[PDB]
């Protein structure tokens, strides 16, 4: 339908927002035991609104949540070294396929 897809797209936004907020909670906490509490508290924010049914209000909450992430985002997030933006990214890559080397170019004949 259309209301199902429009509600589905909202769900994706909330699931991705939560994933990024959770990963950033670890950037600001560093130690595991502080992360536990911080993650529990973030999950409680989402759970308080988990039960809303009005769709315009969902859109407003999603926009507010994205704005909040973007403001309180950690300036220097952790990245796995081989991931894009990582310290090892594009170091000694495997060569591309489809490369041909030509011999005996530019002969006088």
């Amino acid at each position: 339908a259309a209301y199902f897809a429009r509600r589905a797209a909202q769900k994706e936004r909330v699931r991705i927002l939560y994933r990024r907020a959770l990963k950033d909670t670890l950037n600001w906490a560093v130690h595991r035991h502080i992360f536990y509490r911080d993650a529990s508290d973030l999950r409680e924010k989402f759970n308080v609104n988990q039960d809303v049914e009005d769709v315009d209000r969902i859109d407003k909450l999603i926009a507010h949540g994205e704005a909040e992430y973007n403001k309180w985002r950690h300036p220097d997030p952790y990245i796995v070294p081989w991931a894009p933006g990582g310290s090892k990214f594009c170091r000694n890559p495997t060569p591309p396929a489809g490369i041909e080397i030509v011999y005996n170019y530019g002969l006088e004949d």
Partner: peptide
């Protein structure tokens, strides 16, 4: 940088004359 095989994929270094 890296090669861009969608533009160039065949190469030859300098010959003796060059």
């Amino acid at each position: 940088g890296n090669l861009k095989p969608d533009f160039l994929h065949k190469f030859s270094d300098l010959n003796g004359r060059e």
